[PDB]
Design a protein around this ligand. Structure first.
Ligand SMILES: Cc1ccc(C(=O)NCc2cn([C@@H](CC(=O)NO)Cc3ccc4ccccc4c3)nn2)cc1
Ligand SMILES: [Zn+2]
Ligand SMILES: [Zn+2]
Lengths: 953, 956
């Protein structure tokens, strides 16, 4: 009967395993709404997607629509306290964020399930009466500018923008999305523009209800959720905005058959092939784009990649349709290049076109599509339950593209095989319709052009007709075949009955010198999946850098060879994850349990009888050489983190040590390393999912057996299994480590306040304090003081030791950042003594609801247990023990801990801080700091300090 | 002119390099005396040798003459305080000891150079009017029994006495020398003997002046020393005893052509061949024994051992004349056995006789004598200056055998080539008068006889005549040739001039990623010698037990191969020392610098290009397996020390880990290991002696180059050079680790009171406290309370950490030993409070004199520097800086240090204790305190993981 609701759907197609209940509806004002009722969820969540984005920016104020999203957080009329929103979520265990694509601005949050109304009310105000405080407009401009700065020296963004800047300049596609201080402050003032009223103009013009979609998820019933949404969102105004379309492709005849030579920041080698295609979105029911993506992109026997690999030209390939906007899309084929490949770019592309030609002459293959339809069907059927926040947000986005009833199935299920649309898209992938980009350091100095916003250095050339013609006549190659039938598709989805002696937590079911096995049969989610986790201990994996290098190379080489075989399985929802740890190797096998032991067996026996192709070896090594080199071009805040981790762990090899040892690793060498590595091992495993106790026992039995047989593996001695210790800093000591980031003209910092070993008391003391200061820290150091876009606080846990850490990336010097963080610390102490008891119990509550949050998918429960096993702490009931203890802490209890561990003159203050300097470098009252002791040598530092004990199991 | 001196002899011939001055004389009462005047010496010393020993023991009181030795320390008439002697020396930086051989009882001491007189007065009383207190006799008897107990399960001692008990029973040689509680207390009481007056009776009977020789070394002029000796020793009475001789060999015909099968304690395989020979001492100027010893014993090309080694029957051989007594000697050939060798013993002996026959057929070789004479001549000329204590003692013994003028030269210089005596001794080494003994675990249970004093079980057989005959007909073997000219004999002894930029301490003259070189040109001793020390760091030497095993096996194999070549040099006074450490490898080359770089070159070159003989590999491995196994039969106090060292070091593999890992070391796996080890290295070296800066650099570069060329060696990264840390025990913690020693029926204990990191202050605090308690600890825990023969206290230093340690091996349980040590510690706390201020400075001076003692030989100065280099401390002026600080400590400073670190309830007391239990186990004494409740260590690893680790020390 309700006049505020225009249409209800009430039959929302969902996964046959999905227990949550859904109702879709449309409001009077045209807002499309999905309501999700999950009576069990521990956190409620909601999101809104506006179908306007950076593409609709005014041309004279670049980045306006992005800037606007930053602003909506900083206060509304009903709730004018600048951080009232942010703080409510913090005090009730919530979190929020947003993003801005070409045609979307998307806002999401989650909150403790019983404060959904409060959170949603404050959230709905964003779309009704934002303040755009003149004072706040001035500040958060810096957050954006700092954000752009972060991206300036990032190769991925530089390319991203360069493409935009080489098509039609008149096209909205050419726009600079992010915006910076020049585009949003300096230049608008110069031109007499008033940005705050431009924000208001934009908001009032485009944030219309008919362009909005809303998803709300909670514990509340479907009917209650209805009224709640109607109450808060039916007031939103309907300016009835025409939805923008971009029918004219930004790439026109002048922009095709063009070549681009681009200088990277890192030492990387890439080739980018691009085809402008019509907008294929409306053909979603058949998805011709996805079909050709699957084939061109395939990595199996006889694939395009397989051969480019054989010729030693490429390592990786990515192909398929690339999102554009309403009216245009792209089809891309992108490979990375070897040294050799760089000199055979014309050849590589030829190979690309003869594969595309192979596709053309064979015609569309229905059985391939039919396969794709059926895999999706299964993947969708046994879908993992998603975290509320990402689920609502994602769905809010796609409500714009599908009728209410079809949103859950829409981007998963393929329905109609359409061979005509396929040949029509395949017809677009022609040389006369190609754009080619080559990214390589070897174009240094040989370029003549500069892209405005990022400074990117490139060169533009027309591709000679001799070359186009020679591509056009691409004859068939007998090295390219279509994929064979995928044999890894699961058939048995039987959920094994829950055993009698089954346990709530993982039980230790095998305990030998060779191996220690943890097992739990899945009792919560009941999907035909399993998680098989393995840690192989060998001291030889990290004994010295040369060995560390080989430990890495060996697994990389292994993965490479297996890839052809494993890719099929990967597509069939069964995948594996294998890389070396500082203790040996890690191996995870996740997905459908059906064909799981087949892959696992192949992995182990292949690692145990591995024989190395030397051509592969020389390439993987060189690629790794580069990979190590490139860390110098990572972000400053990542450098700080890296150095600290190096500073505070007992044994840790640096990039420079590794990169030197790597010009020393030979082929016959790495060959000697492997059997020696595998000769003595210990294996700790956690098998978890739809597996029975003796099924598990059987699996590890296979793992052991294949190792013993093929690699003569025998147990390590117990005294040989050593975990590393954390450096033990002295009472009242302060150490500073200084380095420069040669690439980014931004500075970084991590500040570390070591407390003591991890224990239920020391844990909750830290975790709670971190919680209380968490939001104020972000507000003070970023929102008010604007030190940078990146500001982080919270616990740090390593080697059984813990403490508080601050991370800031800033345009200001570090030496200054220190005083501000230490200036706040005092601000908190005063504000904590003032904060009321009821405010305090909110934070207790917040941490508690957050720590006790129940895993939604199998994989997440596995990670929780696996955390305890690798950590050697094996405390599976940690969350209940600790939260129970947490609830008994007094306000005083925290003050003591602080004025004893953290305060500028605590008796037990242990503080080391890492300063990473910008490319070019030499308010509340800040306290008087001691004269820090400057670290000149990382090793010498460690030698003159004690090491902590390891934690007790 | 003088009634107290009978003879001032003559000018005592000495090495021209010897700056010390000598006068010999005989006293009126017949004491032969040598006086040594060293105006530079830091410690003075004196010794007395009585030419009476265990051979002259009464038959009913075995071990009396040894026991008497023990007793003379415990008080005399002029100085009656039981430990007056012992204590005087400790307060004046001295030390003392004595020993009792078959025909000698020899007493020596050293003291601060300005208290020679005081020490010597107290010392001379031993020989005039000892007390032999009835109370002390009752106590110190336990010390002797404890001493014997120590030796009971020791195979070397067991063999020693088994020999004695298989010759003529009527002969004095058969006597039991050590004595124990049964022979010296129990049985004499049984038999109505009054032991105290048996001591007196013996002492007055045999400690006659005509049987004594005295050496005194001091700063005083020769004249000053003269009057002093005459003063103190002319009192000694001359009962003029005839000197005992033993003309009748204990091994008669009834004891020859005999075979002995002996069960060992550890797992060893040995063969002992013995020949009774006349006493050759008087032939010292020709020394036919040394000549035949030198040849039979040789290890060079064509040697007896070389062939026995090749046949895979033996690994090591020792031959030559063996001391017996006045009137008889032995000639022995002793080899260790392989598994195979044990089954070819009759063959091995034949080969021995085939070599002896070769010697007979070739006749005496003058050029060999000519060689031996020249090596000795050089060895004596460029002899290292000896520490006073061992020097006086040594000469006191040999004053009985040589004219005064020759005592210094007598045992070095050869004079007469005597082809007749050579041929005469060679005539005695014949099958018809041989004794053979085979020691092996395989005779276990197959024995029928028991040796009384040690319990040794053996079996005696006549050697079948078929076998004797077949040995007698030893034809020549063409694999045996005599040695050629020794090509390593030094000829260039020129002392290179002291360089312009030469330094008092070693300078760092090379500091590269590959190697760090410390160098000092010898500025003190000026002998044509040099010391080349190298530490090779590789993490792969100790990464795991298997690798440690290979690191060892590999160097052992290398040494084995080189041995044939290296032996030549070894005789030429140039030798090498090569062994694996927990950090990599250690290599030292010492001796005459002349042909030194040749040896070093060959070592490195073969080390880098090593090829392994597979037969050698498997044998050495077997021996190492055994060697590891046999640790279960070392002494309880060594077990204690071992466990502690295992407990307190961050990384340390145990024997069981090693021997488990060892059955997995295959020939292919090891051959792969070696190039891995040498691939990346860093080298810290100290070159020190008679070489120039540029000679040193050349040597060190030569080493690198040979490694780089032949083994493609590259530098380690600096962070790869890791030294290990010591465990950091908590405030007020007490941990106990308990183990049983399955072989020895004696128990052991080490108690470690960890203090803190090493520092100029923390060092001297410990060392001074240690000094003060040093002698009292020995007096209380042994002399008074008689807990055992072995009682040790003192500093303990590892990984830059230090603390006080007590080590006791005792008949009583360890849990009790703890109570007595803790009781002693309180005794010290009170006695430091009672002791006078001037008494306190006595100990400071004492420690100072001990720490500031100047090295007398090059090798000893090298050790001090090398100590600083491996320790990573590099503090070359340590002794002056640290002593300077010491002299400023007050009594309070120590009291505080005790109460805060050591006291029974010190706020910062860190105490770990190792309890090693005896074979079968779990009043009028000072008050033992009530102790805390220990946390018993059950797992060595679990223990270490739950504790912090100390920092490493800072250089400079
Ligand atoms: C504790 C806390 C307090 C406030 C926030 C918060 O959402 N502040 C407003 C805001 C944040 N963001 C986001 C998304 C964006 O770039 N939009 O253009 C900025 C962002 C995202 C991730 C970060 C991670 C670490 C440190 C800073 C971050 C900032 N957008 N608006 C987030 C966390
Ligand atoms: Zn942003
Ligand atoms: Zn004795």
């Amino acid at each position: 009967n309700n006049p505020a609701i225009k249409r209800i759907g009430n039959h929302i197609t969902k996964s046959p395993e999905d227990k949550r209940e859904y109702r879709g509806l449309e409001l009077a004002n045209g807002i499309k709404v999905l309501l999700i009722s999950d009576p069990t969820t521990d956190k409620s969540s909601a999101a809104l997607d506006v179908h306007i984005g950076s593409l609709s920016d005014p041309p004279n104020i670049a980045g306006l629509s992005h800037f606007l999203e930053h602003m909506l957080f900083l206060g509304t009329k009903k709730y004018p306290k600048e951080n009232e929103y942010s703080q409510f979520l913090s005090e009730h265990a919530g979190s929020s964020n947003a993003f801005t694509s070409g045609e979307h601005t998307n806002y999401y949050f989650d909150v403790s399930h019983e404060h959904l109304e409060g959170a949603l009310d404050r959230f709905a105000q964003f779309f009704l009466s934002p303040l755009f405080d003149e004072s706040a407009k001035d500040r958060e401009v810096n957050a954006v500018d700092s954000e752009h700065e972060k991206n300036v020296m990032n190769d991925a963004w530089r390319l991203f923008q360069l493409e935009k800047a080489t098509g039609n300049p008149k096209h909205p596609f050419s726009k600079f999305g992010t915006g910076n201080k020049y585009t949003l402050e300096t230049r608008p003032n110069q031109e007499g523009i008033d940005v705050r009223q431009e924000l208001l103009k934009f908001h009032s013009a485009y944030y219309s209800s008919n362009l909005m979609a809303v998803v709300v998820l909670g514990r509340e019933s479907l009917d209650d959720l209805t009224n709640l949404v109607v109450k808060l969102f039916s007031e939103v105004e309907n300016k009835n905005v025409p939805l923008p379309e971009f029918p004219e492709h930004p790439f026109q005849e002048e922009h095709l058959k063009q070549l681009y030579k681009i200088v990277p920041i890192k030492d990387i080698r890439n080739l980018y092939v691009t085809f402008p295609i019509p907008d294929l979105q409306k053909y979603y029911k058949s998805n011709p784009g996805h079909y050709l993506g699957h084939l061109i992109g395939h990595e199996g026997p006889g694939s395009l990649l397989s051969e480019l690999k054989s010729k030693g030209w490429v390592n990786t390939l990515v192909g398929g349709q690339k999102e554009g906007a309403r009216g245009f899309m792209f089809f891309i084929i992108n490979v990375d290049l070897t040294e050799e490949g760089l000199l055979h770019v014309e050849d590589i592309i030829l190979h690309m076109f003869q594969y595309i030609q192979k596709l053309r002459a064979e015609g569309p293959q229905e059985w391939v599509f039919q396969e794709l339809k059926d895999l999706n069907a299964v993947a969708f059927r046994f879908k993992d339950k998603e975290r509320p926040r990402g689920y609502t947000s994602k769905i809010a986005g796609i409500l714009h593209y599908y009728p209410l009833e079809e949103v859950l199935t829409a981007e998963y299920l393929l329905e109609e095989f359409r061979p005509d649309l396929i040949e029509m898209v395949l017809d677009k992938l022609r040389p006369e319709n190609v754009r080619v980009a080559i990214v390589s350091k070897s174009f240094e100095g040989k370029t003549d052009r500069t892209e405005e916003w990022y400074g990117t250095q490139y060169k533009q050339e027309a591709i000679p007709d001799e070359v186009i013609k020679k591509w056009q006549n691409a004859d068939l190659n007998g090295k390219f075949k279509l994929p064979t039938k995928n044999e890894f598709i699961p058939t048995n989805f039987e959920i094994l009955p829950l055993e009698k002696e089954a346990t709530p937590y993982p039980a230790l079911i095998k305990d030998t010198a060779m191996s220690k096995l943890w097992f739990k049969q899945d009792d919560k989610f009941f999907l035909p999946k399993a998680n098989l986790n393995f840690e192989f201990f060998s001291p030889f994996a990290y004994v010295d850098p040369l060995h560390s290098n080989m430990a890495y190379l060996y697994l990389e080489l292994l993965k490479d060879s297996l890839n052809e075989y494993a890719y099929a399985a990967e597509l069939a929802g069964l995948s594996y994850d294998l890389q070396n740890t500082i203790y040996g190797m890690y191996l995870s096998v996740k997905g459908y349990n059906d064909k799981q032991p087949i892959l696992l067996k192949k992995i182990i026996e292949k690692m145990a009888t591995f024989e190395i192709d030397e051509k592969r070896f020389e390439i993987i090594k060189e690629a790794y050489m580069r990979s190590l080199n490139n860390f110098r071009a990572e972000q400053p805040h990542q450098h700080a983190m890296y150095y600290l981790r190096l500073l505070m762990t007992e044994v840790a090899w640096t990039k420079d040590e590794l990169k030197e040892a790597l010009d020393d690793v030979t082929l016959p060498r790495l060959k000697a390393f492997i059997p020696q590595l595998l000769s003595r091992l210990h294996i700790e495993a956690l098998l978890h999912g739809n597996i029975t106790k003796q099924a598990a026992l059987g699996i590890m039995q296979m793992v052991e057996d294949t190792l013993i047989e093929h690699a003569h593996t025998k147990p390590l001695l117990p005294s040989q299994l050593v975990r590393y210790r954390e450096v033990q800093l002295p009472d009242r000591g302060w150490f500073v480590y200084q380095q420069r980031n040669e690439v980014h003209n931004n500075s970084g910092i991590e500040i570390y306040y070591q407390t003591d070993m991890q224990s239920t008391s020391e844990n909750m003391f830290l975790e709670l304090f971190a919680q209380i200061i968490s939001e104020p820290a972000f507000n003070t150091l970023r929102t008010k003081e604007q030190l940078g876009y990146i500001v982080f606080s919270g616990p740090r846990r390593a080697n059984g030791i813990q403490g508080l850490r601050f991370i800031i990336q800033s345009e200001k010097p570090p030496h200054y950042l220190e005083s501000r963080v230490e200036a706040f610390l005092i601000t908190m102490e005063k504000s904590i003594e003032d904060m009321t008891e009821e405010a305090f119990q909110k934070h207790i509550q917040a941490l508690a609801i957050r720590r006790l949050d129940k895993p939604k998918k199998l994989s997440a429960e596995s990670a929780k247990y696996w955390g305890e096993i690798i950590s050697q702490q094996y405390n599976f009931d940690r969350d209940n023990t600790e939260v129970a203890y947490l609830k008994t802490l007094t306000k005083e209890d925290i003050i003591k801990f602080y004025k004893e561990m953290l305060a500028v003159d605590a008796p037990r203050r242990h503080k080391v801080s890492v300063h990473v300097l910008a490319r070019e470098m030499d308010l509340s009252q800040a306290p008087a700091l001691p004269q820090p002791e400057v670290i000149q040598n990382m090793t010498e530092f460690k030698r003159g300090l004690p090491l902590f004990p390891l934690v007790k199991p």
